[PDB]
Amino acid sequence: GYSDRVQQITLGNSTITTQEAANAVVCYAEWPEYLPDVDASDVNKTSKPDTSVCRFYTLDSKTWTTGSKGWCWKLPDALKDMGVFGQNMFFHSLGRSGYTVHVQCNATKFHSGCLLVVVIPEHQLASHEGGNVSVKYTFTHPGERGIDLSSANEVGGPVKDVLYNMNGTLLGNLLIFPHQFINLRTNNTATIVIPYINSVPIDSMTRHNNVSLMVIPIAPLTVPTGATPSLPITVTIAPMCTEFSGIRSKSIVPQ
Amino acid sequence: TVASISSGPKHTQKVPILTANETGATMPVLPSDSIETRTTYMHFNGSETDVECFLGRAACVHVTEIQNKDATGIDNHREAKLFNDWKINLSSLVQLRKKLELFTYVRFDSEYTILATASQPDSANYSSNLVVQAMYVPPGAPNPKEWDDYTWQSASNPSVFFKVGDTSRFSVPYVGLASAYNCFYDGYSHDDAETQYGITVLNHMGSMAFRIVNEHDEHKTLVKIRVYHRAKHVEAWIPRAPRALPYTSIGRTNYPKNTEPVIKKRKGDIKSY
Amino acid sequence: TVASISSGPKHTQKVPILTANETGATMPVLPSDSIETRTTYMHFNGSETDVECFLGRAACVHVTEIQNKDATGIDNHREAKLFNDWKINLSSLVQLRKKLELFTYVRFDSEYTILATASQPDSANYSSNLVVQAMYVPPGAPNPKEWDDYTWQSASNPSVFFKVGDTSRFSVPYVGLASAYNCFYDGYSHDDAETQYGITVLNHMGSMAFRIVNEHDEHKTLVKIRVYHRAKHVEAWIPRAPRALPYTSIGRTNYPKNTEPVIKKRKGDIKSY
Amino acid sequence: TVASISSGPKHTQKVPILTANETGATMPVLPSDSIETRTTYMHFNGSETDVECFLGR
Amino acid sequence: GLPTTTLPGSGQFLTTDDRQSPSALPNYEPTPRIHIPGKVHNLLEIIQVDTLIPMNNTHTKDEVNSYLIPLNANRQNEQVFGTNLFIGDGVFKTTLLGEIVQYYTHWSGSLRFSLMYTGPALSSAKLILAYTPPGARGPQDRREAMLGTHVVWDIGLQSTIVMTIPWTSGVQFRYTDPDTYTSAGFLSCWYQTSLILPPETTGQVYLLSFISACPDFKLRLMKDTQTISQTVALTE
Amino acid sequence: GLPTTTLPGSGQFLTTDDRQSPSALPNYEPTPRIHIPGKVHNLLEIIQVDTLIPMNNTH
Amino acid sequence: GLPTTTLPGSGQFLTTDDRQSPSALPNYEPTPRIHIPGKVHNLLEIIQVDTLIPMNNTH
Amino acid sequence: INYYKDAASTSSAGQSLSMDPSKFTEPVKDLMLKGAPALN
Amino acid sequence: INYYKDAASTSSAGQSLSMDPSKFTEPVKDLMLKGAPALN
Amino acid sequence: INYYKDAASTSSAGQSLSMDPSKFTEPVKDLMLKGAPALN
Ligand SMILES: Cc1cc(CCCCCCCOc2ccc(C3=N[C@@H](C)CO3)cc2)on1
Ligand SMILES: Cc1cc(CCCCCCCOc2ccc(C3=N[C@@H](C)CO3)cc2)on1
């Protein structure tokens, strides 16, 4: 009586149940694991807070309306302030982590709409100015708020044009990245497990984000007659196999 | 190898063509799941689509130019093209760039070919024979100030001398600092409020300096350098969506404003053929 | 091997020389069936009549020309021969064409040799040294518009750079879409009422583009390109009647009107020697 | 080859980090004598610092 | 001294040749490789992942909406969409498949075309997808369409339908770039019965459509893509 | 570096010589051969089929 | 005479390449080596000897 | 025959002949069998 | 010795030494023996 | 393969792979053990 459909994920002191899942994706078919010695470089023993950092943090909720263009969060940024995960983050020189991402959106059998939930490794954004204008730090570190693709261009911020993925590629091809759809008629959640993907064994958690999670409405939300025209979307994310190394004074970052 | 097996009528409870794309999978459906097929063999291996093959041919990565002329009274050799210099990079020209950016991280050895041809746009009695000297000036090492500085001694820095009209060829191991080169980097060099974003900060490869060894003749001679790059021993990770809009800058993803629609509009209906 | 066996007088009921040609056969009759012969050996193998040998020597297949000159103010490089281009084909010149069309389908690898020589028809101080760059522009890939377009980067398209006066040589596998190249094709590309007839539609091989890499000197230089083609690994099917009338077009069988009698008229009688 | 071995807390009478430089020696002290380390390998031979290489171009 | 003769081609530079060269950095030791998920070995590996087709190409500036094929409730017998199968051009051209095919001159193989339905769960519909092999015109009505490769799709719990365009061809390779002789057919879709919405519901519903290549597929003779060009070298 | 000497004829192009060359299309896979009746191997095979002689050349 | 083809790079001088050359002094006999204390093999050997740092740079 | 000492100086590599699209085409956590229902 | 990797790059092929004119000179359905009458 | 007769004409030497810093880092007459007191 197991269905692909019902699932339970327990991680730390927190549990999620979905009764309307559509399997789960594990990026590149690899599950998060700690850093092996053969791959290690820094000689420091690392710190593995385990259950105090590897639990589920639910970010603040978004509201899908007929005019929504899509939202974008960066990792580990989105979690920069969650509990002890965040403290560890500002206090060590280097850290490394994988995540379980669970995006939630329920409706009824009269609604229609379909969101794309995708994880993009190394999502370098484009400046809407063109040329070689850079995208300032603050703009690519929105924190739990994430970036709202239907917000206005700002100065020093990225471009927010959806048919171009914020980088000069077409929305249609985002499907080459680990992703899952939430089609109100099928699905009510999306779950993706992200292994740590980098060109170095461990890195800085503040100067470099290693994935952007993106939720994009593709088939517009259509509510039943005289229904309220909107649904909330909630994102809950859990660091998994986290390791921190090179402890010290506590980083100070712009803004 | 069979490309298609033989398959006949079906009346089952087992439907391989109905799936749920919401899952993120592309189910491996074949012609024989939905029509009646006959056996056929592949006769093919997919040899020429190997990434080593795809990135393994020489591509032009840079065209520069230097001239041989009397430096007498020149206050700025660099500025007179008495010796140009190139900030090594692999995204200045776009044919090869779009190919590499199909991947996120890439690792390979490089084979460089350098072709140098001379031009004599204004009245010369003859064509002189010039020897070019291209130096590798990695970051931290004195960079040439005049076309005949102590720098050119290049006692510790690899340099090649070849003749204009000829070609020079040598191969450099993968010089990246990390395990792969980042084709993309969503980071900064530090948490500064105004530091540049992108890979410009990561792809710190240093520059390469060219000059003519010959002193000047009576006429002036323009030498134009073309650098070709071939990846050998390629390794590529994490495929990405291909580049759709035009490029504007080395190292940023930025596209131009008021660009044009990249998807061709139908001449007719959705229903049109 | 015997070329003739010894044979003596015959008075038989078994006549090998009477046959019925209406059957379509050529009965294998020999000297020894009708005269008295002596033994003789062949001393020969027929080596130099092998089709690999017959089609295996280089033949000139194309002569084109490009010039190096100041492109300043040229509105149409292609038109100034600032870079010509050739619609690859193998019937433009006829010596090799008649040889190939002795067969209906032919399959082979090609070895190309390209000789480039320069001419300076009007007053020059000297002969410059130019490097040619020939690109393979298969169908579907951007074709060059100026003599120094992004196209020439040729990041994915094989190109060779050699010096004028020298020769370039490389070999291309059999690139046909079918199992053999059609020397003839009695069809159309589709059942259209006005589409072209012939092979022109089948022998879609794309074109090859040449240019000089050098910028301009003070004089002008004419470079004339000759492409030679040698078949290697030849396979030929279905022999046909040799070409009798002159050719008029690449890819059609058409002969010229009011052509001349191709059979030599006797100077004398049927009875004449 | 290991570049660093794994080493944990220490509370000894055996102090490798106190020396007397007046002796003229450079005592071979390592990260693992004064912090807690994890194993890591060298992955490197020191090929390009050989004097033949240094004076050989 | 051993006697030699040099052949035609000496000194040429062929961008596609593969030979040895002296290393400029003798004895240098590259950084160790660490493990990174996601390694690609063949472009054939990636063109089997499906991506969305902007089938609804009828707009005037690129929009998220050209990915949506609309469906109308209560229409009978009628046609949902049509397209030829020049995978190197037109709708296909910007898709990952289209985009890679363009790096090669010839392709052969089967294509997988699937449609995922996004209408309310309490609605229902039956569509017919038809592949018309080269030689006939794009079908003009379902009767015409239904006589060639087709699948009646019944919209249900299982949200997507995967249609395969089996390789139907005389010649074993076709050009990517639009060739006539080499052309592959048409793909059309019609109401089999009709879309029906539940009460309290209204308007258009959309289908998303994807394209990917079957394991069948072959691509050969690499060349340059018409999809990217430039007028001056970029700088930093 | 192995010592060599080049002989007379170096650099010449003889249309009849038979040597190896680099392939411009590294790794390309040609179309499979299918069977076709009629293969010719030697011109000696075909000159044994008889054909008509315009003997009456007098026109 | 063995057929050859020369590749791109022929005739170049790369200061970092390592090949054989004819000896200008054929048959000459170098002075014997005697023992000398102190041989260095790697620069890695010497950067492990400590030296003083002008830390007080303020002059 | 390598004429040179360093590995970077050798010619192009030789075909992976690796090929495994499943990391890209089927990265699902619970295995999907073709023919069995997608969602149970 | 092939110096190159691809088959197209090898020299000319070597003599068929196949040679069988009968597909062209005697494509008759019922075998004709020289010496026996052509038409029986 | 050496093509030449004299030893000077051969290419560069090959890595010492000798490496022993103790003549430079620990030339002390009585051996010092790390961890034991420097001056007893
Ligand atoms: C004489 C002489 C001259 C030289 C040059 C040595 C080569 C050094 C260059 C190293 C390779 O440089 C790069 C730069 C960028 C990238 C790259 N950028 C991303 C888009 C992808 O790859 C890769 C290699 O060596 N000897
Ligand atoms: C640089 C560079 C330049 C090139 C050219 C590649 C060769 C492509 C040409 C392929 C062979 O072309 C043909 C064309 C026609 C025929 C043919 N036509 C009939 C009469 C018979 O054969 C055969 C081969 O490759 N690299």
Short mmCIF file of C-alpha atoms and ligand atoms in Angstrom, two decimals, chain B residues 88-91 97 100-101 106 108 110 112 114 134-136 158-160 170-173 175 181-184 199 203 205 208 229, chain E residues 24-25, chain G residues 14 16, ligand 1:
data_model
loop_
_atom_site.label_atom_id
_atom_site.label_comp_id
_atom_site.label_asym_id
_atom_site.label_seq_id
_atom_site.Cartn_x
_atom_site.Cartn_y
_atom_site.Cartn_z
CA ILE B 88 44.65 35.16 -21.30
CA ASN B 89 41.06 34.16 -21.24
CA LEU B 90 38.84 31.81 -23.23
CA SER B 91 35.57 33.68 -23.55
CA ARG B 97 32.53 29.95 -25.61
CA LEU B 100 32.26 25.27 -23.24
CA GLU B 101 29.34 26.83 -21.36
CA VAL B 106 35.54 21.67 -17.25
CA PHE B 108 41.55 19.82 -19.76
CA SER B 110 45.47 23.04 -23.69
CA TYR B 112 47.97 26.37 -28.34
CA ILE B 114 49.86 30.65 -32.79
CA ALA B 134 55.59 35.24 -27.13
CA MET B 135 56.16 35.11 -23.35
CA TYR B 136 54.05 33.65 -20.64
CA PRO B 158 58.50 29.75 -20.77
CA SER B 159 58.84 31.63 -24.07
CA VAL B 160 58.71 30.44 -27.71
CA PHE B 170 53.19 23.86 -27.57
CA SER B 171 50.78 22.50 -24.92
CA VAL B 172 50.25 23.64 -21.32
CA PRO B 173 48.98 21.29 -18.57
CA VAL B 175 46.85 25.21 -14.75
CA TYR B 181 37.89 25.50 -14.17
CA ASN B 182 34.54 27.13 -13.24
CA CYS B 183 32.57 27.95 -16.39
CA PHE B 184 30.29 29.83 -13.99
CA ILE B 199 34.48 34.37 -12.53
CA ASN B 203 39.92 32.73 -13.76
CA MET B 205 45.27 33.10 -15.39
CA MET B 208 50.77 36.39 -22.48
CA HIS B 229 43.21 26.64 -28.51
CA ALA E 24 55.63 24.64 -21.94
CA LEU E 25 55.51 23.85 -18.20
CA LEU G 14 60.68 27.00 -26.84
CA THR G 16 61.46 25.08 -21.88
C1 LIG K 1 55.40 30.53 -24.55
C2 LIG K 1 54.21 30.16 -23.74
C3 LIG K 1 52.96 30.78 -23.67
C4 LIG K 1 52.24 30.07 -22.80
C5 LIG K 1 50.88 30.15 -22.26
C6 LIG K 1 50.60 29.11 -21.19
C7 LIG K 1 49.13 28.79 -21.07
C8 LIG K 1 48.43 29.47 -19.93
C9 LIG K 1 46.92 29.54 -20.08
C10 LIG K 1 46.20 28.51 -19.22
C11 LIG K 1 44.83 28.12 -19.70
O1 LIG K 1 44.01 29.30 -19.58
C12 LIG K 1 42.65 29.23 -19.40
C13 LIG K 1 41.83 30.35 -19.21
C14 LIG K 1 40.47 30.18 -19.07
C15 LIG K 1 39.90 28.92 -19.10
C16 LIG K 1 38.45 28.77 -19.04
N1 LIG K 1 37.51 29.81 -18.76
C17 LIG K 1 36.23 29.40 -18.82
C18 LIG K 1 35.07 29.79 -19.67
C19 LIG K 1 36.47 27.94 -19.15
O2 LIG K 1 37.82 27.66 -19.25
C20 LIG K 1 40.72 27.80 -19.26
C21 LIG K 1 42.09 27.96 -19.41
O3 LIG K 1 53.00 29.05 -22.34
N2 LIG K 1 54.26 29.13 -22.97
#
